[PDB]
């Protein structure tokens, strides 16, 4: 008989180079020598937050007592963006939990124990340097503008909801970073745009997608759900009506197969119903600490897209 013990894996690959086609962090895993630097049995502490907004998802990691060779490989490439993937689970499988580029790295080795630090960004390089220069005339179909701008961003299309037969009412011009322009189109058309684990997600506010996840005491829930406001401020109201404005909170054992834009079903004894996801935070302490995930849910009032 065994116990139920945690497991994880961390991989470091070649520098990421942006080209003239969508970037996939998967293909950069292999190093010039072939197999990548894998780190399994070392105490690790990490925190990974995810959201549906302009900003990329960022995660922090700490590793104790790394071998000198690995640290040397990171002393080099300090000018470059190494690709990194993280996996976690329970002794039988490990689900992808983050993938991005090493934004920052530093080492402090006071006496007894060295402590390496990381800051990782989910597509930070693309979202902050992809320039654009486009224009359109009166009568252009809005569905064409959306596709044109996304292709400029150079990322795979996770999911998109086209506008239909919508047409521009006035001439438009777009410059600067493509991400910023798209985030502005979100406000005026009730659409949510956010990149996550390399995938572009374009959806409509208020509406939600089946029960892709069910939460219950069998599903490793942790404590009862509690109602928490989804924003730190309140807006004036007429009392688009379809927009968000309500939510709840839940916690569960670590499970990387969840994304901010997904949908979940809450099977508890007090609260029951369907909710959207709005925010994720993954925490982990291998030898000591939690191994759980926190979800911020938001009520929905739109159509079932």
């Amino acid at each position: 008989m065994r116990a139920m013990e945690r497991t994880y894996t961390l991989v470091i690959g070649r520098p990421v180079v942006i080209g003239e086609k969508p970037v996939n962090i998967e293909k950069f895993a292999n190093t010039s020598k072939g197999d990548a630097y894998e780190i399994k049995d070392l105490h690790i502490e990490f925190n990974v937050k995810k959201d549906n907004s302009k900003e990329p998802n960022k995660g922090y990691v700490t590793v104790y007592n790394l071998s000198d060779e690995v640290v040397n490989y990171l002393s080099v490439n300090q000018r470059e963006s190494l690709a990194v993937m993280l996996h976690a689970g329970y002794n039988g499988d490990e689900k992808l939990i983050f993938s991005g580029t090493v934004e920052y790295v530093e080492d402090d080795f006071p006496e007894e124990t060295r402590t390496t630090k990381f800051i990782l960004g989910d597509g930070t390089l693309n979202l902050t340097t992809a320039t654009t220069a486009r224009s359109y005339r009166k009568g252009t179909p809005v569905n064409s503008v959306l596709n044109d701008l996304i292709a400029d961003l150079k990322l795979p299309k996770g999911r998109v909801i086209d506008f239909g037969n919508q047409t521009l009412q006035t001439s438009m011009a777009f410059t600067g970073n493509a991400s910023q322009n798209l985030a502005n189109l979100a406000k005026n058309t009730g659409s949510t745009f956010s990149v996550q684990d390399g995938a572009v997600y374009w959806t409509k506010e208020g509406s939600r997608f089946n029960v892709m996840f069910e939460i219950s005491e069998e599903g490793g829930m942790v404590g009862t759900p509690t109602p928490k406001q989804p924003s730190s401020s309140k807006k004036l109201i007429k009392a688009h009506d379809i927009k968000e404005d309500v939510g709840m909170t839940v916690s569960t054992l670590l499970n990387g197969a969840i994304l901010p834009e997904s949908t979940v079903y809450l099977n508890t004894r007090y609260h029951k119903g369907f909710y959207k996801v709005a925010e994720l935070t993954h925490r982990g302490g291998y030898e000591t600490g939690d191994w759980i995930t926190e979800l911020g849910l938001v009520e929905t009032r739109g159509e079932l897209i």
Binding site: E55, K58, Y60, E103, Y104, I119, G121, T124, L125, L127, T128, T129
Partner: peptide, 26 residues
């Protein structure tokens, strides 16, 4: 003991600086 607290405050300041200053060609 203030040593322990100063470290956490420093790390939070570092995270905020990173959030403000990131990416970009300039």
């Amino acid at each position: 003991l203030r040593n322990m607290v100063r470290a956490v405050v420093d790390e939070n300041n570092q995270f905020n600086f990173n959030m403000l200053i990131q990416g970009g060609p300039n």
